[PDB]
Amino acid sequence: QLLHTAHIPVRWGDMDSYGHVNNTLYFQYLEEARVAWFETLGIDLEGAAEGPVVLQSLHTYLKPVVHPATVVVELYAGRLGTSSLVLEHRLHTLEDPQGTYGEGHCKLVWVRHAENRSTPVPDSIRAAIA
Amino acid sequence: QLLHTAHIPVRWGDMDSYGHVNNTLYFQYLEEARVAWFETLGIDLEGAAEGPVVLQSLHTYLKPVVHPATVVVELYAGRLGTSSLVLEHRLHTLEDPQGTYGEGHCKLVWVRHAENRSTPVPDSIRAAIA
Amino acid sequence: QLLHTAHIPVRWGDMDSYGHVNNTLYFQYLEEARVAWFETLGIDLEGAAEGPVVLQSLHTYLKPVVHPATVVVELYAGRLGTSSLVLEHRLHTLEDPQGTYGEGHCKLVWVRHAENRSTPVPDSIRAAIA
Amino acid sequence: QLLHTAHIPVRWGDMDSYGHVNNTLYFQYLEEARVAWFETLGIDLEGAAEGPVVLQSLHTYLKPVVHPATVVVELYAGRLGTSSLVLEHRLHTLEDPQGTYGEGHCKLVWVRHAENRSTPVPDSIRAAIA
Ligand SMILES: [Cl-]
Ligand SMILES: [Cl-]
Ligand SMILES: [Cl-]
Ligand SMILES: [Cl-]
Numbered sequence: 001q002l003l004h005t006a007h008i009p010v011r012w013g014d015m016d017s018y019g020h021v022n023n024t025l026y027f028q029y030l031e032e033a034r035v036a037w038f039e040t041l042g043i044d045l046e047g048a049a050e051g052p053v054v055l056q057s058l059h060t061y062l063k064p065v066v067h068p069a070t071v072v073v074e075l076y077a078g079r080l081g082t083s084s085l086v087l088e089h090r091l092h093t094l095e096d097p098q099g100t101y102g103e104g105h106c107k108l109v110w111v112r113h114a115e116n117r118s119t120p121v122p123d124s125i126r127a128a129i130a
Numbered sequence: 131q132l133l134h135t136a137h138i139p140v141r142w143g144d145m146d147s148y149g150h151v152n153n154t155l156y157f158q159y160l161e162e163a164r165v166a167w168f169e170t171l172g173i174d175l176e177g178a179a180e181g182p183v184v185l186q187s188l189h190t191y192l193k194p195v196v197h198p199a200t201v202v203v204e205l206y207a208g209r210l211g212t213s214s215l216v217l218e219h220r221l222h223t224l225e226d227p228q229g230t231y232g233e234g235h236c237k238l239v240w241v242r243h244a245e246n247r248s249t250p251v252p253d254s255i256r257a258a259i260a
Numbered sequence: 261q262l263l264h265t266a267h268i269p270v271r272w273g274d275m276d277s278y279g280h281v282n283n284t285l286y287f288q289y290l291e292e293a294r295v296a297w298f299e300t301l302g303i304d305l306e307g308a309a310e311g312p313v314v315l316q317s318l319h320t321y322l323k324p325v326v327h328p329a330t331v332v333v334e335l336y337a338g339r340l341g342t343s344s345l346v347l348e349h350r351l352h353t354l355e356d357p358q359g360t361y362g363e364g365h366c367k368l369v370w371v372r373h374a375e376n377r378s379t380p381v382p383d384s385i386r387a388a389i390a
Numbered sequence: 391q392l393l394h395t396a397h398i399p400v401r402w403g404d405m406d407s408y409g410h411v412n413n414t415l416y417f418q419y420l421e422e423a424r425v426a427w428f429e430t431l432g433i434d435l436e437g438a439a440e441g442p443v444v445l446q447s448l449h450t451y452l453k454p455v456v457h458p459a460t461v462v463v464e465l466y467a468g469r470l471g472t473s474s475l476v477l478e479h480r481l482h483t484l485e486d487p488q489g490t491y492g493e494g495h496c497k498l499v500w501v502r503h504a505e506n507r508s509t510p511v512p513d514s515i516r517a518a519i520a
Contacts, residue, residue, distance in 0.1 A: 271398075
């Protein structure tokens with residue numbers, strides 16, 4: 001199930017000395033896409049007592065991106081636990097909407113932060129998925 | 131004279147622990163705007179033997195930007211020398227198009243890179259300004 | 261087998277609005293550690309016709325880092341193929357040398373870049389591992 | 391008067407497609423140096439009700455830095471007002487301690503943040519300077 005599609009313009013300063021987007025920056029793109037998805041659901045990250053924490057990131061690099069470009073990040077529902085969710089991702093560009101530039105996943109766990117303890121996934125996400 | 135207006139979306143990761151865009155990032159926004167202006171003029175930065183080099187950056191911070199936001203960078207023609215140009219800038223947001231969030235300038239000098247020597251400003255810029 | 265230990269100071273600007281190092285930045289730390297390992301082996305990344313390309317990154321986030329801190333990145337030899345190597349990593353801090361802050365791996369493939377084709381791993385790495 | 395000397399290792403990912411440190415990153419180096427100076431004075435930036443805010447940054451780029459390198463940031467006392475201080479800077483490298491790679495200043499104003507109003511510079515800084 002597709003949860004969210006984000007369009008993330010590439011900045012010239014995102015490139016490294018290889019002259020393509022630096023490999024680190026793809027994780028910022030993925031972060032931006034999740035933040036936008038969270039925003040659509042009123043999860044604002046703005047110092048809430050409970051919210052999603054990244055446990056694990058996996059990314060496979062398949063094709064480089066070169067400025068100027070707009071990266072398209074598709075987020076898909078992976079497995080939902082009581083307090084965790086796997087968000088699967090695929091990355092394309094606007095000019096190359098069917099090329100897969102990279103893919104992977106982000107495992108999120110919902111935690112009450114001041115307490116360091118897992119808490120249930122919000123109703124909105126259960127509703128979206130389930 | 132207004133040379134270029136760029137729209138630069140703010141990324142959540144652009145913020146620092148103060149919860150506003152980190153002061154360093156405004157220079158990336160200014161860089162992106164100049165790169166876009168250069169692109170409109172076919173100055174591609176893509177390893178040309180000659181091109182613009184930043185000599186000096188000045189920026190005055192007036193109002194913070196908080197995600198989500200789109201920064202609007204206006205570039206104005208400052209003083210043009212035989213091989214240098216002052217690009218004056220003003221920064222607003224899309225939601226606050228008349229608030230000045232920051233302002234300053236970037237002095238550019240055209241140089242042949244392998245030689246470290248100043249060269250004339252391209253005709254396109256002289257034409258645009260003059 | 262431990263291949264390399266890098267010490268990577270944390271910069272204040274590495275933190276995000278959560279007030280810990282931004283999750284993206286751990287990949288820069290891992291990149292810096294690999295670049296330093298490569299440097300010890302005279303793999304300079306400086307535009308060589310052949311060299312290592314990141315195929316995949318996996319990282320598990322276990323404990324946050326807060327500025328000021330020095331991240332310690334340990335790189336271990338994972339599985340070696342004819343033209344690929346898995347570099348396994350563990351992350352600690354100088355003050356907490358036995359806490360595991362994160363762990364994962366980076367799969368590298370050696371490729372001739374202008375040709376997009378896999379090439380053998382350098383003798384130095386085979387020698388180090390084997 | 392020299393207030394502080396910081397040593398800031400350059401990271402490979404600090405470089406852009408020109409193959410030198412990206413011009414934006416010098417401002418991060420300057421930020422790191424000020425944060426370290428502030429730390430020596432027990433100004434911790436960690437959510438204090440009052441503290442220094444950057445009003446203006448000026449930097450002149452004189453020589454590029456190429457990885458690997460350690461940037462040396464020297465901070466000097468410029469003019470002290472009742473609630474502002476100009477911190478003048480000069481940038482060198484460890485290998486080139488007398489080459490000036492860049493120079494400029496950062497104007498800081500002390501402000502109570504929740505109120506947006508200038509407040510006196512801390513005794514420690516007046517003592518250091520005066
Ligand atoms: Cl595109
Ligand atoms: Cl906006
Ligand atoms: Cl530490
Ligand atoms: Cl050095």
